[PDB]
Amino acid sequence: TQRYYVERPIFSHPVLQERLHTKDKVPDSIADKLKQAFTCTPKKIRNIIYMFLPITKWLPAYKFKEYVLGDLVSGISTGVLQLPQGLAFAMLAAVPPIFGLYSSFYPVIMYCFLGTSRHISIGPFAVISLMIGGVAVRLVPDDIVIPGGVNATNGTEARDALRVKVAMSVTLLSGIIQFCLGVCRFGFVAIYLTEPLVRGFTTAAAVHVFTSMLKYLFGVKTKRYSGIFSVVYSTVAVLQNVKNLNVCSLGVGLMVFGLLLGGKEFNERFKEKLPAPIPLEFFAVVMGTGISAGFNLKESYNVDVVGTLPLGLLPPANPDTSLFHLVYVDAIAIAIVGFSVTISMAKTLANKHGYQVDGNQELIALGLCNSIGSLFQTFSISCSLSRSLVQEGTGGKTQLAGCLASLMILLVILATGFLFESLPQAVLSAIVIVNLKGMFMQFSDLPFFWRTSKIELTIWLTTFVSSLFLGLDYGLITAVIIALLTVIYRTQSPSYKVLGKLPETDVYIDIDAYEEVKEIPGIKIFQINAPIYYANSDLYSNALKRKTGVNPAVIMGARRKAMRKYAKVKYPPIVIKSTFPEEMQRFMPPGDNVHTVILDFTQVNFIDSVGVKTLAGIVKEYGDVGIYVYLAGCSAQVVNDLTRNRFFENPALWELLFHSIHDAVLGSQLREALAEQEAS
Amino acid sequence: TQRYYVERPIFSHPVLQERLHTKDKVPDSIADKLKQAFTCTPKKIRNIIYMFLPITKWLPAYKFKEYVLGDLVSGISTGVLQLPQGLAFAMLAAVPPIFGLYSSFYPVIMYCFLGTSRHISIGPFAVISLMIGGVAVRLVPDDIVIPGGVNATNGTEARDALRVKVAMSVTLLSGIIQFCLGVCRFGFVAIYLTEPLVRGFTTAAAVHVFTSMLKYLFGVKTKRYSGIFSVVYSTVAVLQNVKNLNVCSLGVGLMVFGLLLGGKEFNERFKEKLPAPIPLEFFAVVMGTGISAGFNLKESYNVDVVGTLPLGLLPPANPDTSLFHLVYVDAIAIAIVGFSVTISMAKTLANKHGYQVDGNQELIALGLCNSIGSLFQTFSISCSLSRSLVQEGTGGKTQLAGCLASLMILLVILATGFLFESLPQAVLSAIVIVNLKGMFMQFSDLPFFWRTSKIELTIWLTTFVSSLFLGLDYGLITAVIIALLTVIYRTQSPSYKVLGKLPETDVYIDIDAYEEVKEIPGIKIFQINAPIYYANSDLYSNALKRKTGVNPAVIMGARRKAMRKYAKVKYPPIVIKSTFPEEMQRFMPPGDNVHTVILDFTQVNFIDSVGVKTLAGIVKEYGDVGIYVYLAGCSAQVVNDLTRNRFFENPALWELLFHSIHDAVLGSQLREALAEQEAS
Ligand SMILES: CC(C)CCC[C@@H](C)[C@H]1CC[C@H]2[C@@H]3CC=C4C[C@@H](O)CC[C@]4(C)[C@H]3CC[C@]12C
Ligand SMILES: CC(C)CCC[C@@H](C)[C@H]1CC[C@H]2[C@@H]3CC=C4C[C@@H](O)CC[C@]4(C)[C@H]3CC[C@]12C
Ligand SMILES: O=C(O)c1ccccc1O
Ligand SMILES: O=C(O)c1ccccc1O
């Protein structure tokens, strides 16, 4: 075995520097640092193509034997869920339902070619649908008259067409913004989305969607509220109008809701019994449409249905740029929110399955998908939380599962779009509510974060409140800023400790922690685990004067008190010897007689101009009353900050630095002993 | 002499903890922590009275012999400057000039009793006057007709009265806000005003005031612009209308401007020749009014003058609360800006003269001053930069200098208010411009901050730009947020270093720095001088895998490449031994053969849940390829973060911690030697 044993002279700063000679670095010209980027070797261009076109990467290396069954089952199980969710989100956007299926096919196909993550199901999203519907209603209210040959029997088809055009324009603008952000390498901002913030934002969005689904379930009409305090206004509106509900719609919605809970719990408790989970949503919609067609609930009890569904695909429609100046803000908000949600899901799924995703490629893929979708009659979309988990939980392994879902959505569009025209809105509302239960389950993080780390609990609660009451567009920004400022709070509330020396060793630990550490007499040690930047210097000085019990101001006051009570280019020395008579010392109230204060800088990352000024003031003031101050553990970075500022214009301040606490202790003790020698 | 010498066993975590026994703390009940606050000893109540009423402190201890002359000279020299500045700021607020003298007397008298700082000259401020004028014009335009018995010969007196009432209401609201903030102990926020931010904000405000003074100097009329892009719009407006200037007003303004520069430079170069500096502003206004009265410039050349000045004080006027819902935002902005500026000046003057100021008492004093001034026909004010520098520079020592200035302003109000009625606006504009030169001089910080610290230069430029183009109300908030986020940027761009061991000692320094440090073979050391919070873990992992040249992913890839090329409750061990055949090692491209990676945690202040997850992933992944990872310098705080999270559910991870880099090196070397022993 071996024991920790080192023998060496006391390493102050000048003693250590005379033993070290700076190395000569190799400068890299900014001109020669650009030439090597244009070698254009086949490997480099192949890597670039692989980066921009991930389909060329994971498709040739497709391991058939263990991917075919999982991909097929996951694709079927996610398409059967994407259909009712697509229709439901279409109605939330104040657009005809067929546009939900239009928006659930083109971007999925494009993301199967341009996407990096291989476990997310891109498609219609509830939050994006809500925001698109809000802007569509804001631009096009229910009071627009068009004399385009239509008689007095207006079916509001013109209003729906204008709303569709508004959604297309804002989607195209959001896609262009996302593409421009992606090519600008901005996707590096996704790292600021901490896990508690994402969980809180998703839960708040889940509450918004759940409360926005109540009017669809009950069947009562209610004007849509968008903006600040939207959730509370919407819920009080639906509560005021609840007296005029539709009994049959509520009954069928509650029945399918209970059936969905029963089936989901059955699958959960019979997980081992199944080779592949049964698609419950498909059975739910089949039952709903069968009953509705059986009893003709559209008119017999005034139970509104999804409506007619035209067939056939549409040729590309070149949009107009006449609405950009009206919806430019909301398009930016849509792009930011969609990218944030999709990057959070892609990152967490990649971490779970052991790989990596690219933020910039995600932005580029979303931008191209949204833009070309706007050319192809499609509104803005992003990743979907519940749908992606359903696709993965059933054995999703590559992105071909999304392609299969897109293909079956195409099949429904072309062939059996008429079959679902009688589906009541209650079934879709209950399906959305039941699939959103997984997001209600995230309240378990409240006691958990309370036990583990209260700062993250504060971030979670602040994000949830800011995204619930205020609009989702600005709640995310507010939560991000609060999360960033929590670091500032942490650096403004550090742990000031006074250290003591373990006997016979060099381990220095807090004096009030372990009952065996003993403070060295005449030497006080202070430690701060935080930088000394502008918003921290004053607190550091106050803590130094309070914890150590050595305040030069009160020392001078007591010295003058004893004085009045008894009576009835070169630089000056940093430490002024105590010009206090020994006879006057008899009238000097007792004290610890501290002769040196050691400052620990091992846990100080940086110091700025305000910090340097405060440190110089501390050194000068403490030296005024004849108390030496040494800095221990000054890293090379902090030494550079001190040198850059005006701290070291007096060369005699070089010797105050040291390398370790024990080095400073040995130096101070040796200096005291040397001063003892010449005393007598 | 003594040499650094320590002999001790290797201190891992369990070895150190078995030698330490936790002390028992003394709990302080939240109930008994409140009882001692109500002792109500005479000393405590005396201290409270001293805190709330600083006049009771520095007045009884007034040292006459060295304060009388300095206070008198400073008070005279600051009153003679406060008068023209008060009149000039009155006209900038779109109120009759007499209200400038009303606002220059009451709050100065009150701050002489309720103020803490003893070197600032409270009074009218250019920025506050500009904002008050902006809100007054916004509420009361030039198109208001009142049929209150006034004939068609309307002198716009009603419009001026409404503007005065608006200013009074907003001033009272701002005063109430300041008082409520002060009693709430909110004045603790003043620490976020770093020096570069304050300097940049003051320079931007100086530019705003200078460009707002051009129309007064030239004599041309120009409608006032308030809000975003106010400076550029105002300067292009005054440039477009310059063709209709008044020659005589410009001539007298330039003459007094040149005289002021000449006299100021004369005082600067004859500083030693004077016992007390001559008041140049008084001579300037005397000359201007003498010439204007001599030639009657009010009508002879259409040179506008300050106008008539009514005498006599006014009885208190109880305001109205009918304008709060219109000006509540601007009152809040006024309060914040005024408190920020005054606290910056008070803090810097206290630091210069060696004492301290209280932010909360400053807020309380400003709130009471503004409120009771609004009762006494006075608009909102705060500290004045140039006036305070003039007061302190001539020998201002206590707050009685402000009282003398208030008394002489009262003398002018009561007796000689008519004498200054013919003073041209050109003289006042040139006086404001010449006294604001000291704020133009602050561009010298650009090369200075460029040389010292580029981050503070970025803060300075961002503050200047955000406060120049955008309005001063929101530029301050934007600059504060940017300054706070610079810390986040600093923690996101740390300095990753790979350390080496100085021979025969225990000093570990960067391997690419000093040419004598030598890396220990088989051991790689990594150090980060930043926390490991959520927005930093990914960069830390990438830097660890790049700098040290030990990437487990590429190691596994190379191992599998050699493999395919050659062929033609208990827990598992953390480190899995390399199941790689020695024959396959012959096909394994050469490497450094690193057997242990040491992570330096001496400069890590805190770690959060994301950081803990990343650290656990690093440990597991590095142990997968048979590479031990040790943590060195884990402080008790970081150990607490790791324990609170789920890092230590496997007790075998306790031994991975250590106390110092050399301890970890010795432990790893000893473990390798022990593994060597049983090999053969
Ligand atoms: C620490 C953080 C929160 C500081 C910055 C907060 C900013 C981004 C917040 C605080 C107050 C917010 C505003 C509050 C209310 C509204 C009205 C609403 O109809 C549109 C958004 C808007 C205008 C918000 C925009 C974002 C906002 C200005
Ligand atoms: C945290 C970092 C990004 C700084 C944030 C600065 C925020 C709070 C600033 C910057 C730009 C500001 C906006 C600029 C202009 C206007 C128009 C005005 O009629 C009302 C206030 C309003 C809407 C401001 C609100 C506050 C604002 C949004
Ligand atoms: O339906 C979803 O998948 C969903 C996901 C997140 C938030 C609200 C939602 O409705
Ligand atoms: O007159 C001043 O002292 C002053 C100070 C700061 C900004 C504008 C100003 O006019």
PDB file of N, CA, C and O in Angstrom, chain B residues 593-619:
ATOM      1  N   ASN B 593      -4.275   3.748 -23.909  1.00  0.00           N
ATOM      2  CA  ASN B 593      -4.552   2.745 -22.881  1.00  0.00           C
ATOM      3  C   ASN B 593      -4.851   3.405 -21.535  1.00  0.00           C
ATOM      4  O   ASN B 593      -4.240   3.094 -20.511  1.00  0.00           O
ATOM      5  N   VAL B 594      -5.803   4.338 -21.546  1.00  0.00           N
ATOM      6  CA  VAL B 594      -6.215   5.003 -20.318  1.00  0.00           C
ATOM      7  C   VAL B 594      -6.999   4.024 -19.455  1.00  0.00           C
ATOM      8  O   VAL B 594      -7.923   3.353 -19.932  1.00  0.00           O
ATOM      9  N   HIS B 595      -6.629   3.934 -18.180  1.00  0.00           N
ATOM     10  CA  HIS B 595      -7.282   3.019 -17.255  1.00  0.00           C
ATOM     11  C   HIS B 595      -8.065   3.724 -16.160  1.00  0.00           C
ATOM     12  O   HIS B 595      -8.737   3.050 -15.372  1.00  0.00           O
ATOM     13  N   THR B 596      -8.000   5.052 -16.081  1.00  0.00           N
ATOM     14  CA  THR B 596      -8.742   5.796 -15.070  1.00  0.00           C
ATOM     15  C   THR B 596      -8.857   7.243 -15.516  1.00  0.00           C
ATOM     16  O   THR B 596      -7.873   7.829 -15.976  1.00  0.00           O
ATOM     17  N   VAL B 597     -10.051   7.813 -15.385  1.00  0.00           N
ATOM     18  CA  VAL B 597     -10.305   9.211 -15.709  1.00  0.00           C
ATOM     19  C   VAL B 597     -10.712   9.916 -14.425  1.00  0.00           C
ATOM     20  O   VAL B 597     -11.676   9.507 -13.765  1.00  0.00           O
ATOM     21  N   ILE B 598      -9.985  10.970 -14.071  1.00  0.00           N
ATOM     22  CA  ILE B 598     -10.237  11.729 -12.853  1.00  0.00           C
ATOM     23  C   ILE B 598     -10.988  12.996 -13.230  1.00  0.00           C
ATOM     24  O   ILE B 598     -10.535  13.763 -14.087  1.00  0.00           O
ATOM     25  N   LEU B 599     -12.132  13.219 -12.595  1.00  0.00           N
ATOM     26  CA  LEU B 599     -12.919  14.426 -12.799  1.00  0.00           C
ATOM     27  C   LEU B 599     -12.669  15.373 -11.633  1.00  0.00           C
ATOM     28  O   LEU B 599     -12.831  14.986 -10.471  1.00  0.00           O
ATOM     29  N   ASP B 600     -12.273  16.603 -11.942  1.00  0.00           N
ATOM     30  CA  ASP B 600     -12.055  17.618 -10.921  1.00  0.00           C
ATOM     31  C   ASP B 600     -13.371  18.317 -10.614  1.00  0.00           C
ATOM     32  O   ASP B 600     -14.002  18.887 -11.511  1.00  0.00           O
ATOM     33  N   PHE B 601     -13.781  18.276  -9.348  1.00  0.00           N
ATOM     34  CA  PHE B 601     -14.999  18.936  -8.897  1.00  0.00           C
ATOM     35  C   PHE B 601     -14.705  20.026  -7.875  1.00  0.00           C
ATOM     36  O   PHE B 601     -15.615  20.475  -7.172  1.00  0.00           O
ATOM     37  N   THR B 602     -13.446  20.457  -7.773  1.00  0.00           N
ATOM     38  CA  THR B 602     -13.103  21.520  -6.837  1.00  0.00           C
ATOM     39  C   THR B 602     -13.735  22.844  -7.238  1.00  0.00           C
ATOM     40  O   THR B 602     -14.020  23.679  -6.373  1.00  0.00           O
ATOM     41  N   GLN B 603     -13.962  23.055  -8.534  1.00  0.00           N
ATOM     42  CA  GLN B 603     -14.521  24.299  -9.045  1.00  0.00           C
ATOM     43  C   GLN B 603     -15.942  24.119  -9.569  1.00  0.00           C
ATOM     44  O   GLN B 603     -16.353  24.800 -10.510  1.00  0.00           O
ATOM     45  N   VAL B 604     -16.702  23.206  -8.972  1.00  0.00           N
ATOM     46  CA  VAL B 604     -18.108  23.006  -9.300  1.00  0.00           C
ATOM     47  C   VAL B 604     -18.923  23.394  -8.076  1.00  0.00           C
ATOM     48  O   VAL B 604     -18.792  22.777  -7.012  1.00  0.00           O
ATOM     49  N   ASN B 605     -19.761  24.420  -8.225  1.00  0.00           N
ATOM     50  CA  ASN B 605     -20.478  24.961  -7.077  1.00  0.00           C
ATOM     51  C   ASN B 605     -21.732  24.158  -6.761  1.00  0.00           C
ATOM     52  O   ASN B 605     -22.027  23.902  -5.589  1.00  0.00           O
ATOM     53  N   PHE B 606     -22.483  23.755  -7.783  1.00  0.00           N
ATOM     54  CA  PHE B 606     -23.717  23.016  -7.565  1.00  0.00           C
ATOM     55  C   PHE B 606     -23.995  22.142  -8.777  1.00  0.00           C
ATOM     56  O   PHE B 606     -23.503  22.398  -9.878  1.00  0.00           O
ATOM     57  N   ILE B 607     -24.798  21.107  -8.554  1.00  0.00           N
ATOM     58  CA  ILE B 607     -25.248  20.212  -9.614  1.00  0.00           C
ATOM     59  C   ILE B 607     -26.725  19.919  -9.386  1.00  0.00           C
ATOM     60  O   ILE B 607     -27.154  19.703  -8.248  1.00  0.00           O
ATOM     61  N   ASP B 608     -27.509  19.955 -10.458  1.00  0.00           N
ATOM     62  CA  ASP B 608     -28.947  19.762 -10.383  1.00  0.00           C
ATOM     63  C   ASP B 608     -29.326  18.405 -10.974  1.00  0.00           C
ATOM     64  O   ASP B 608     -28.465  17.593 -11.322  1.00  0.00           O
ATOM     65  N   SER B 609     -30.633  18.160 -11.100  1.00  0.00           N
ATOM     66  CA  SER B 609     -31.110  16.844 -11.516  1.00  0.00           C
ATOM     67  C   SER B 609     -30.591  16.469 -12.897  1.00  0.00           C
ATOM     68  O   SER B 609     -30.178  15.326 -13.121  1.00  0.00           O
ATOM     69  N   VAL B 610     -30.609  17.413 -13.840  1.00  0.00           N
ATOM     70  CA  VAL B 610     -30.066  17.136 -15.167  1.00  0.00           C
ATOM     71  C   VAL B 610     -28.574  16.845 -15.077  1.00  0.00           C
ATOM     72  O   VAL B 610     -28.062  15.931 -15.737  1.00  0.00           O
ATOM     73  N   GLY B 611     -27.856  17.615 -14.259  1.00  0.00           N
ATOM     74  CA  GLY B 611     -26.440  17.352 -14.069  1.00  0.00           C
ATOM     75  C   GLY B 611     -26.176  15.998 -13.439  1.00  0.00           C
ATOM     76  O   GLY B 611     -25.237  15.300 -13.823  1.00  0.00           O
ATOM     77  N   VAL B 612     -26.997  15.614 -12.459  1.00  0.00           N
ATOM     78  CA  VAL B 612     -26.831  14.310 -11.822  1.00  0.00           C
ATOM     79  C   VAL B 612     -27.087  13.191 -12.820  1.00  0.00           C
ATOM     80  O   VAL B 612     -26.362  12.189 -12.850  1.00  0.00           O
ATOM     81  N   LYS B 613     -28.126  13.332 -13.646  1.00  0.00           N
ATOM     82  CA  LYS B 613     -28.398  12.321 -14.663  1.00  0.00           C
ATOM     83  C   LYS B 613     -27.244  12.209 -15.649  1.00  0.00           C
ATOM     84  O   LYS B 613     -26.830  11.100 -16.008  1.00  0.00           O
ATOM     85  N   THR B 614     -26.706  13.347 -16.095  1.00  0.00           N
ATOM     86  CA  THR B 614     -25.577  13.317 -17.018  1.00  0.00           C
ATOM     87  C   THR B 614     -24.353  12.683 -16.372  1.00  0.00           C
ATOM     88  O   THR B 614     -23.636  11.906 -17.012  1.00  0.00           O
ATOM     89  N   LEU B 615     -24.098  13.001 -15.100  1.00  0.00           N
ATOM     90  CA  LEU B 615     -22.956  12.420 -14.402  1.00  0.00           C
ATOM     91  C   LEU B 615     -23.106  10.912 -14.249  1.00  0.00           C
ATOM     92  O   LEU B 615     -22.140  10.163 -14.436  1.00  0.00           O
ATOM     93  N   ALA B 616     -24.309  10.448 -13.900  1.00  0.00           N
ATOM     94  CA  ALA B 616     -24.543   9.012 -13.794  1.00  0.00           C
ATOM     95  C   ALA B 616     -24.368   8.331 -15.144  1.00  0.00           C
ATOM     96  O   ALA B 616     -23.799   7.236 -15.227  1.00  0.00           O
ATOM     97  N   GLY B 617     -24.853   8.963 -16.212  1.00  0.00           N
ATOM     98  CA  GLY B 617     -24.643   8.414 -17.540  1.00  0.00           C
ATOM     99  C   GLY B 617     -23.174   8.341 -17.909  1.00  0.00           C
ATOM    100  O   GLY B 617     -22.721   7.357 -18.497  1.00  0.00           O
ATOM    101  N   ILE B 618     -22.410   9.378 -17.561  1.00  0.00           N
ATOM    102  CA  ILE B 618     -20.974   9.375 -17.832  1.00  0.00           C
ATOM    103  C   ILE B 618     -20.301   8.230 -17.089  1.00  0.00           C
ATOM    104  O   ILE B 618     -19.494   7.485 -17.658  1.00  0.00           O
ATOM    105  N   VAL B 619     -20.633   8.067 -15.807  1.00  0.00           N
ATOM    106  CA  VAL B 619     -19.999   7.027 -15.001  1.00  0.00           C
ATOM    107  C   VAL B 619     -20.318   5.649 -15.565  1.00  0.00           C
ATOM    108  O   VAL B 619     -19.426   4.812 -15.746  1.00  0.00           O
TER     109      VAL B 619
END
